[PDB]
Design a protein around this ligand. Structure first.
Ligand SMILES: Nc1ncnc2c1ncn2[C@@H]1O[C@H](COP(=O)(O)OP(=O)(O)OP(=O)(O)O)[C@@H](O)[C@H]1O
Ligand SMILES: Nc1ncnc2c1ncn2[C@@H]1O[C@H](COP(=O)(O)OP(=O)(O)O)[C@@H](O)[C@H]1O
Ligand SMILES: Nc1ncnc2c1ncn2[C@@H]1O[C@H](COP(=O)(O)OP(=O)(O)O)[C@@H](O)[C@H]1O
Ligand SMILES: [Mg+2]
Ligand SMILES: [Mg+2]
Ligand SMILES: [Mg+2]
Lengths: 122, 81, 187, 470, 487, 35, 466, 105
């Protein structure tokens, strides 16, 4: 009983890492990573997985963080390290985006180079 | 079943519109068989409207039951985890 | 990190905490020291004073965590079992303390090679016969195994003996024989 | 590699615990100690060094503590020319009893979809020889088609007719994936292909690869067999540049297998009992079936519609993944008209006067308009009868009945059902016939003359012979 | 007799004791036993309780094994010993099961002694793949005019019987079983069809009535009746269709032809739902488990026609499905309709309007079609099908009425295919439009009486060659013309 | 809701179909005789 | 063996045993109660705890209260001494006439009769009810089911059957009142006392009564049907007697099972019912049967929730019956009583080789003409009567006459209708319906066939209207 | 003394989980420290589920629950004629208390 009551966490506490800005994947499945630690993360804050995938902290629970993964599940395994980015999700804005095809995060998917915008917006 | 009731509602709404138009056309052509056709189509439209009202009650009842049944299925699936 | 799994597996809250302590003690080969310290903790908390103090759910968690840390330092306990009791106190699983102790105890009992053997008989069985039975039952074991025999008496088996060696099982009662013969006659 | 142990077996879902080296999600695991090959696909990491897996075969006889070996990769199937003329199952084993499939390369059945820059915007019509399809909802070379229909309306017959016509008119390594369908039909298709020269048992000049995971398979196999067939077709498209044909019957079974394992994977049910991940699963599978700039994949998918709903989440989610949807109506099959295509429910993205021409577009739109007006006039027929309509209304009804009959066409694969011989009608013949029936050039011929014929010359000949006898 | 009890009933009893691998019941209730231990038990393995009860291990979990009890859980207590049998569930199979009424595990419940069965066969075997099969060509004769003409069934096909309650589904199955006596006593060995009736969740007196009908018509000598009735444990009703399918697979694999009826699969779905909900597996649509389609699909795939290299045997399946208020769109009906090779739809309106058997020819389809008919039946039945479709369109009309009244048939009256060809012929050639619709039935009765009494030559000819040749065409031409003149 | 009377398959959907076939079977006999 | 209560949730009680865990279905006695509170073991929970179902109210139970194990399931008195007496679910007398001094006791949980004990004979049982006798005749030794929604006449019909069959019956009779009105039980008791079927002074009583009514907690309502079963089974087996078993209402067995299944910790099935609905119903229903040791003719009223025949409980009951009488609310609003739906009621002896070709042909023709009328209903409703053929008008007129003539005044219904009841022989029913189908009364008005007995009363009423 | 007195564990959804009350009967009236009354619905091995006859706003975690020893009953008699009472028998017409001599479950 309990997401953070995995035997490894408990035996590590019995034996006697930064659990503030860093976490560890307790379980991953169907795009939802339960992350141990990350005690300073904010609700709806963008996090960073060890494989480079990004996530968003949607469920802040007493002993785990429910993080939705911005990609495929195979690149995330149990015990992977999760970092904070300290920021809520934001996109680039400006007239530099007129004529571009971007994805849900303002990344160009048309091959015409990086969006040279100077302004970002939550 | 919700789809059977919707089929029947649609059918009887169409019958009601057609008999109403036929009543108006007989009312124009009457201005003894034309009077009989006018009154007959008026009665057919009235009966179709009553069947439409009863079937609309049945349809609302059935759609509320269907929503409740699907919710109960989802709840019972979630409670077994 | 890699965890060391005990020979037997227990599950639940008690099973997870016992597996944790077992791996953490095999990390430092202090199994018997922490075993007896857990027995001491279990007898400490079971006495109505500490039981009523820690099973009380409206007194604050941190207060009982402090009291448990006090009482585990006062009795000269290892850091392993001390932070184990602290962990049980933060997660609020102090109610599961006796279960954790029992799971660890059965883990270490099977780690000693102790197999639970039951020998049911119709009547209170003879003592030299029972010693011969012990000697014969040691033959079903691997090496490093000892028989923890507890023979309860069921008079309804009409005779013979029903022996259970761990999960192995021989039904040598005579009631089984008569039931087989009855099934054979009727079929 | 990593070695784990089975700790739980509940149905087709198997939990495996690893001491060293947890395998990533989607990896294939081999169960040791089995006389046949049992592959477990990792689905979830449960914590506590345990993964939850779906079995590709039956789980009877599995024991807790049974050892499992990590492959280190997803399910890898043989790809290449040597797959042509062979039948393989979900995990790439040959099931035609003709020995190992010896290819030079293997491909994982889980791959990323092509990027946005890899798309191609070219749309060229693929003429099928079927009048209703060619006219009202034409197919495109390298587009996704999709055939919707309930049980017993003609999806299998239509897909076999398309196989016949296009796949032998084609020269580019078709692939057929049988997903959760009948084994009798798979045997039938195999033997029709051996008999019609498309599969060559000796002197291997075969041009179709077969992948089959049928109804008797567990849900994991029926959920991954579409990806296996997709992977064969993807190899043919990418690492050869070839233009490929992919036939999938039936693609609803992919979603249905997902839903069958959903709850045992620990997932709260969604609407209509479907898994919560229905749309994203269908999307990750369907976005790989596509024409890129590297090569073309013309995809024909049969899509089962449960209880003839079409608002069920599975067909409704499939609709947006297609370029020319052909919808088979049971009401039209009950009229004796075959194929049972619904003319007022089938749509093509190349039904554009700037792509097919103004004559074809105008004829198609006029056919659909006269059929819609016929639908509306049937009400007044029901109330008043056919004798109290205007004469132009009677003309509309007569021409609409003739257009309905003439939309039906006898198939080569249906001679055993129909008795009639097959007809393969060119595009301009179709447009011309329907243009003439619309213009009123055959109000003297009876409606039955247009039923189950080819071009309009066959219609006039049939009318002549019926006049001779009747 | 005190010699029928001591001869070897006592001296031969397998008195040896074994070192058993066992578990221990943690909890028991509603026919689900949670068992501690049983470390090496297999999934779907049959285990044994200390009370003689048997169970199947379905849920292999880390701390317990969920065992479904093949009987009453009243005899199981907490702490009872559960022995391993080391075997996956299997049943006796063979020719010795013919004539016997057995339960879901193969024990005779007809009080006639043990089944002298030497062969056993798992109940959960995999169906034959693509290669061992061949197309369905041989006709499965039902003896029902409407079926044998408009919805023909071949050997190796799965034809669903679906309808409401009391529409006549069991009657179709029992007519089909009674009909096979003409071939099962004949000399053609490849025409014999051994039948299997699986009674699932039925009243026990209903099964007794059915066995009475099958013994009256002397149909029990080639029929196995598997009975998992309403008082049997849900595991037994879940397992009865698979036991019956194994008993039929035996014949399918030994070059013989078998027919199996699952009456009905809705009650098996209900019993499976009970077992699953009590095993705490999460419910799906209408609380059914997620894999109920797999339940029926892995069962109905085992009906198959084999090729020559595998014996040439077959297994035909006639599953029965009961719908509520005619809702064909329900969960289990749609599953089974998508599985099978066709459906025979029965209706209550058609039943009460006098159309009996109440087959809905508009909806009833046979995906095998004319591929598995005799040539004579095909010749007459293509015309009958077209004319009946046209009659349904305009409801000529008197010919259509004649044909419908000719499709009617009494119960337990399965006709030979030659006699069916004769009556369809008489109706399709115009020799009944002189007759008013009301007397068609007795005209037909007298007609077949006369024909079988005086014209065994023509019927034997039609039987041998399979087609109605122009010689025999003209012959029955004059025969029916003379009879109608005399009628 | 066009053609919803025939699509509901009632006593009115059967009456409609019977009419269309009766009227067009008489027309086809009158159109084949001349043909 | 003695245990202690550890949990009480409604009718469900958890009991923890230090020694001697009692088997499932054993009856437990709670200590320290004013009356006898029996717990029936339902589940073994593990850790030496059982989960039971209480046969009475659980108010006042304290955790730790002592509980004795009886050593056997609920045992009721069976014998000829139960005739004329009323007992509750646990066999206690509730008629204030002292103890039922039988010489044997039988557990209410028993095995169903085997397959080799079944009896196949199917002789008819004439009831005097025209629609029943004509369209869905009952069989002696068979299982009759009366389906119906709230207030359509299941109790009226079952009381008419008690009046028409049980008094003319030669054997014994058992009425199990399951979850119904207590005042109806009082009415039945006193009616049987005045009609002499129950005798308070000697041993000539012919009926045994078992009542657990709708004021009872769900355990009593779930087991009282089994108690009545047990009495009838004793009469069938150890006496070899022909038994009449009336159960009203048998749906309450399933409803009470659902109520307790809520608390037994089981995942609900469709419509919130227990997952064990069908197997519970089968275990109960298979004991209500004719064996070759004795006969039980069984009449069961099945309640239909919200008039939905597709509800799991009536839908499951349908398979256990030889004859079903389905009462319809729509037919009851037309004033036709009994409200039997003639196109929904069936019987297995409706077979020409069992009832004769005359009976069979009359019944099938009646059902044909009623189905044809039902098919015409839409056109009649919208386009009026005048848009039909003449044959359709003749069909409608004959079908309406037949609908009227299917109704009948009951002797139990005299009190609130004033019309004297009618008991129509089967010959007169077949004759009257044959004559109406022939057209011999196409000149009489339809309102002359309403609420009459034989067809002669129909022509007399026609002569008195004109 | 956790035998005639308990402490509220949880409150919400109209049910108060109470720790203690070891001698409480099933369907017995309990009295909360706020002046509200409840009914013992679920006697469980580790808590008592109490149906609160009033608003959950008045009951907090940690509040004291005393048992009244009586299965839920109301005042009955002639003294209620002319009075307007609530579901528990308390007069809500401001005419003073009910002078009833008899209670009834
Ligand atoms: N072809 C027929 N002609 C006349 N009567 C028939 C015919 N078929 C069935 N019946 C009768 O109609 C009734 C239907 O019962 P049957 O068992 O055949 O159908 P069923 O679908 O299995 O019903 P259920 O499953 O509810 O018991 C039976 O009484 C039967 O005698
Ligand atoms: N083009 C057709 N011509 C004639 N009959 C057809 C045609 N298509 C289907 N049918 C009929 O409908 C039945 C269903 O065929 P099938 O292709 O298997 O439909 P589905 O796969 O959608 O269930 C066929 O067996 C056949 O009888
Ligand atoms: N045979 C009948 N004749 C006249 N009225 C009847 C008849 N049966 C039922 N009713 C009417 O229905 C009412 C109640 O019927 P009832 O026996 O209580 O059925 P149920 O038990 O299903 O509620 C009766 O008071 C009466 O008004
Ligand atoms: Mg198909
Ligand atoms: Mg039946
Ligand atoms: Mg009543």
């Amino acid at each position: 009983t309990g997401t953070a009551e995995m035997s490894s966490i408990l035996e590590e506490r019995i034996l006697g890492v930064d659990l503030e800005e860093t976490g560890r994947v307790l379980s991953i499945g169907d795009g939802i990573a339960r992350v141990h630690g990350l005690r300073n993360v904010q609700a709806e804050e963008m996090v960073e997985f060890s494989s480079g995938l990004k996530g968003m902290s949607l469920n802040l629970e007493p002993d785990n963080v429910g993080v939705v993964v911005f990609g495929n599940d195979k690149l995330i395994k149990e015990g992977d390290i999760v970092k904070r980015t300290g920021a809520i999700v934001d996109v680039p804005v400006g007239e530099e985006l007129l004529g571009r095809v971007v994805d849900a995060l303002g990344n160009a998917i048309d091959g015409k180079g990086p969006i040279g915008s100077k302004t970002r917006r939550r | 079943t919700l789809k059977d009731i919707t089929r029947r509602l649609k059918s009887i709404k169409n019958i009601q519109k057609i008999t109403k138009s036929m009543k108006m056309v007989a009312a124009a052509k009457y201005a003894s068989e034309q009077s009989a056709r006018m009154t007959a189509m008026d009665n057919a439209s009235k009966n179709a409207s009553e069947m439409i009202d009863k079937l609309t009650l049945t349809f609302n009842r059935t759609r509320q039951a269907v929503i409740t049944k699907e919710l109960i299925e989802i709840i019972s699936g979630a409670a077994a985890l | 990190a890699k965890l060391v799994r005990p020979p037997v597996q227990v599950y639940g809250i008690e099973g997870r905490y016992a597996t944790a302590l077992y791996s953490a003690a095999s990390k430092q080969n202090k199994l018997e020291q922490v075993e007896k310290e857990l027995l001491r903790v279990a007898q400490i908390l079971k006495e109505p004073k500490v039981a009523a103090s820690v099973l009380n759910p409206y007194v604050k968690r941190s207060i009982k965590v402090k009291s448990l840390n006090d009482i585990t330092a006062k009795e000269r306990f290892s850091p392993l079992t001390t932070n184990l009791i602290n962990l049980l106190a933060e997660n609020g699983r102090l109610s599961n303390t006796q279960g954790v102790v029992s799971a660890f105890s059965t883990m270490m009992s099977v780690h000693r090679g102790e197999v639970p053997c039951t020998v049911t008989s119709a009547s209170p069985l003879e003592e030299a016969t029972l010693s011969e039975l012990k000697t014969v039952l040691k033959s079903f074991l691997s090496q490093g195994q000892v028989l923890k025999l507890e023979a309860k008496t069921d008079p309804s088996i009409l005779g013979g003996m029903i022996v259970r060696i761990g999960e192995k099982y021989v039904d040598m009662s005579v009631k089984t024989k008569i039931q087989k013969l009855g099934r054979a006659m009727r079929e | 590699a990593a070695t784990g142990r089975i700790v739980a077996v509940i149905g087709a879902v198997v939990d495996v615990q690893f001491d060293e080296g947890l395998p990533p999600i989607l990896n294939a695991l081999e169960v040791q100690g089995r006389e046949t090959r049992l592959v477990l696909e990792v689905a979830q990491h449960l914590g506590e060094s345990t993964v939850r897996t779906i079995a590709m075969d039956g789980t009877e006889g599995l024991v807790r503590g049974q050892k499992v070996l990590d492959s280190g990769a997803p399910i890898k199937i043989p790809v290449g020319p040597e797959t042509l003329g062979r039948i393989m199952n979900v995990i790439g084993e040959p099931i035609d009893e003709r020995g190992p499939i010896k290819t030079k390369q293997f491909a994982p059945i889980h791959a990323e979809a092509p990027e946005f820059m890899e798309m191609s915007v070219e749309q060229e019509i693929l003429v099928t020889g079927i009048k209703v399809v060619d006219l009202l909802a034409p197919y495109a070379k390298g587009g996704k088609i999709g055939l919707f229909g309930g049980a017993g309306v003609g999806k299998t017959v239509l897909i076999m007719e398309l196989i016949n016509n296009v796949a032998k008119a084609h020269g580019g390594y078709s692939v057929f994936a049988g997903v959760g369908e009948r084994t009798r039909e798979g045997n039938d298709l195999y033997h029709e292909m051996i008999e019609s020269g498309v599969i060559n048992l000796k002197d291997a000049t075969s041009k179709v690869a077969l992948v089959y995971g049928q109804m008797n398979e567990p849900p994991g196999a029926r959920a991954r067999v579409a990806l296996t067939g997709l992977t064969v077709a993807e190899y043919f498209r990418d690492q050869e540049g070839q233009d490929v044909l992919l036939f999938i019957d039936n693609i609803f079974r992919f979603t249905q297998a997902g839903s069958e394992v959903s709850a045992l994977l620990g997932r709260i049910p969604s609407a209509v009992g479907y898994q919560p991940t229905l749309a994203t699963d269908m999307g990750t599978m369907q976005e790989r079936i596509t024409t890129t700039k590297k090569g073309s994949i013309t995809s024909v998918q049969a899509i089962y519609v449960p209880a003839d709903d079409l608002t069920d989440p599975a067909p409704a989610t499939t609709f947006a993944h297609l370029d020319a949807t052909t919808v088979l109506s049971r009401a039209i099959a009950e009229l004796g008209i075959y194929p049972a295509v619904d003319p007022l429910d089938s749509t093509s993205r190349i039904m554009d006067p700037n792509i097919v021409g103004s004559e074809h577009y105008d004829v198609a739109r006029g056919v659909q308009k006269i059929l819609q007006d016929y639908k509306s006039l049937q009400d007044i027929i029901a109330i008043l009868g056919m004798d109290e309509l205007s004469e132009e209304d009677k003309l509309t009804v007569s021409r609409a009945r003739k257009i309905q009959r003439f939309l039906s066409q006898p198939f080569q694969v249906a001679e055993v059902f129909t008795g009639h011989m097959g007809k393969l009608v060119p595009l301009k013949e179709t447009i011309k016939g329907f243009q003439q029936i619309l213009a009123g050039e055959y109000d003297h011929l009876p409606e039955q003359a247009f039923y189950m014929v080819g071009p309009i010359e066959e219609a006039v000949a049939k009318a002549d012979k019926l006049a001779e006898e009747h | 007799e005190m010699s029928s009890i001591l001869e070897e009933r006592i001296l031969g009893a397998d008195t040896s004791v074994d070192l058993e691998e066992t578990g221990r019941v943690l909890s028991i209730g509603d026919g689900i036993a949670r068992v501690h231990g049983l470390r090496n038990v297999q999934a779907e393995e049959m285990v044994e309780f200390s009370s003689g009860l048997k169970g199947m291990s379905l849920n292999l979990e880390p701390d317990n094994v969920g065992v479904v009890v093949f009987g009453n859980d009243k005899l199981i207590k907490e702490g009872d010993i559960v022995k391993r049998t080391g075997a996956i569930v299997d049943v006796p199979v063979g020719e010795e099961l013919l004539g016997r009424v057995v339960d879901a595990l193969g024990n005779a419940i007809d009080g006639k002694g043990p089944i002298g069965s030497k062969t056993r066969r798992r109940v959960g075997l995999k169906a034959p793949g693509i290669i061992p099969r061949i197309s369905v060509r041989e006709p499965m004769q039902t003896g029902i005019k409407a079926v044998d003409s408009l919805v023909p069934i071949g050997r190796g096909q799965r034809e669903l019987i679906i309808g409401d309650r009391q529409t006549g589904k069991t009657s179709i199955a029992i007519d089909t079983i009674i009909n096979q006596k003409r071939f099962n006593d004949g000399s053609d060995e490849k025409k014999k069809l051994y039948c299997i009736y699986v009674a699932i969740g039925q009243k026990r007196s209903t099964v007794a009535q059915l066995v009475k009908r099958l013994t009256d018509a002397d149909a029990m000598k080639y029929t196995i009746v598997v009975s998992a009735t309403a008082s049997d444990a849900a595991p037994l009703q879940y397992l009865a269709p698979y036991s019956g399918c194994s008993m039929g697979e035996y014949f399918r694999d030994n070059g013989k032809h078998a027919l199996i009826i699952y009456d009905d699969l809705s009650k098996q779905a209900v019993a499976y739902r009970q077992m699953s909900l009590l095993l705490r597996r999460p419910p799906g649509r209408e609380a059914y488990p997620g894999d109920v389609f797999y339940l029926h699909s892995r069962l109905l795939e085992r009906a198959a026609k084999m090729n020559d290299a595998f014996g040439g045997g077959s297994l035909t399946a006639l599953p029965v499905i009961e719908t509520q208020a005619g809702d064909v769109s329900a969960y289990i009906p749609t599953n089974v309709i998508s599985i099978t090779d066709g459906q025979i739809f029965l209706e209550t309106e058609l039943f009460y309007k006098g159309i009996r058997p109440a087959i809905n020819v508009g909806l009833s389809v046979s995906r095998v079609g004319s591929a598995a008919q005799t040539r004579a039946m095909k010749q007459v039945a293509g015309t009958m099908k077209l004319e009946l479709a046209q009659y349904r369109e305009v409801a000529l009309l008197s010919r259509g009425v004649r044909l419908t009244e000719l499709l009617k048939q009494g119960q337990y009256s399965p006709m030979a295919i030659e006699e069916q060809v004769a009556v369809i012929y008489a109706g399709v050639r115009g020799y009944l439009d002189k007759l008013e619709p009301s007397k068609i039935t007795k005209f037909e009765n007298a007609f077949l009486s006369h024909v079988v009494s005086q014209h065994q030559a023509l019927l034997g000819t039609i039987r041998a060659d399979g087609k109605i040749s122009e010689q025999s065409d003209a012959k029955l031409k004059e025969i029916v013309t003379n009879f109608l003149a005399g009628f | 809701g066009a053609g919803s009377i025939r699509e509901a398959g009632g006593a009115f959907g059967k009456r409609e179909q019977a009419e269309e076939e009766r009227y067009f079977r008489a027309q086809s006999r009158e159109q084949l005789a001349a043909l």
